Write a protein that binds this ligand. Structure first.
Ligand SMILES: O=C(O)c1ccc2c(c1)nc(Nc1cccc(Cl)c1)c1ccncc12
Ligand SMILES: [Cl-]
Ligand SMILES: [Cl-]
Length: 328
């Protein structure tokens, strides 16, 4: 019976065409205008290349979509359309097809990013505040647009640390939020899955993304990446419970009438809730402050309803130094 505290009805207040992505008819341009220069990587249903638009010499990336996944292609395309111009959202430049095979591809702006494993060990206190604030702008925007990203993780938060640019990428798992809708829990990377996913609670909302963001914040301020390093989905919840506590987990389950898979009985143990200060030591103390811990404590909560919204997080004192610099 759970619903989002913010933007709950926003899709129902829009035209059906906004959210009815199965009815969306993309305009497919011609991929022949793009020259592929380098393969960047591959996902389950996609492959990304650096490319040049031969008509204007612009560097872009091209994400070729395994064509069988028709509904999921329309979903990602419609979501990106709806997010057009959103702050710190990766810009979709065009939707194209190989004109012979008809295989579809998405063309995005190119971001010259610093890979996160290297970047996160050199961030300053101000840097973390700045980049988290910029990521929150993207999440507040997509949530306000009725969309849950559902795959927030370091790889999907591209950061150009020279130009101070951030983009939230890979909307392939994103979905429209509708009150009382039950969603597939097989979303997000293991380390970024909220407890709701790990306990099979399907009536989740935008607040899933705020758990994932909290995991990223913890990894940055404490220099433990990923912060909750489970070996599988069961162990992931155990790792969370060793920090947030087991009695606190059971109170969450009871509130939402959540059934707990009995395999957990043999592995959860009994764990006190830990103080966040327990994670401080000489290597991270310059990144941790009372305001960072207060914010983190309000994000990494079992109860998805009680987590801060992206807006509430942006309003937190931890970001005041960023707001002050962005106005002065
Ligand atoms: O899916 C998107 O929305 C998406 C959108 C933009 C980028 C992307 C994925 N992946 C990139 N790089 C990358 C690096 C390693 C593996 C893979 Cl598969 C991709 C990349 C690089 C530079 N500029 C934009 C992007
Ligand atoms: Cl779903
Ligand atoms: Cl721990």
């Amino acid at each position: 019976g759970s619903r989002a505290r913010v933007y709950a009805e926003v899709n129902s207040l829009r035209s059906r065409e906004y959210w009815d992505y199965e009815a969306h008819v993309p305009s497919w341009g011609n991929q022949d205008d793009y020259q592929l220069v380098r393969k960047l990587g591959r996902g389950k249903y996609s492959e990304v290349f650096e490319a040049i638009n031969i008509t204007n010499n612009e560097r872009v990336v091209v994400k070729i979509l395994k064509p069988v996944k028709k509904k999921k292609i329309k979903r990602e395309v419609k979501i990106l359309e709806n997010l057009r111009g959103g702050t710190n959202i990766i810009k979709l430049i065009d939707t194209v097809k190989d004109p012979v095979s008809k295989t579809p591809a998405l063309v995005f702006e190119y971001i010259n990013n610093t890979d996160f494993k290297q970047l996160y060990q050199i961030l300053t206190d101000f840097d973390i505040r700045f980049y988290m604030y910029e990521l929150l702008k993207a999440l507040d925007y997509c949530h306000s647009k009725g969309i849950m990203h559902r795959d927030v993780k370091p790889h999907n938060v591209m950061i150009d640390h020279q130009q101070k640019k951030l983009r939230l990428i890979d909307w392939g798992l994103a979905e429209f939020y509708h009150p009382a809708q039950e969603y597939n829990v097989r979303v997000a990377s293991r380390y970024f899955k909220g407890p709701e996913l790990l306990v099979d609670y399907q009536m989740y909302d935008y607040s899933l993304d705020m758990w994932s963001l909290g995991c990223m914040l913890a990894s940055m301020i404490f220099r433990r990446e990923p912060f909750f390093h489970g070996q599988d989905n069961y162990d992931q919840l155990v790792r969370i419970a060793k920090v947030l506590g087991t009695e606190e987990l059971y109170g969450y389950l009871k509130k939402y009438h959540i059934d707990l898979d009995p395999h957990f009985n043999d592995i959860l143990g009994q764990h006190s809730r830990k103080r966040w200060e327990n994670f401080i030591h000489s290597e991270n103390r310059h990144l941790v402050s009372p305001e960072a811990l207060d914010l983190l404590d309000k994000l990494l909560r079992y109860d998805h309803q009680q987590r801060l919204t992206a807006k509430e997080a942006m309003e937190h004192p931890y970001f005041y130094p960023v707001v002050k610099e962005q106005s002065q």
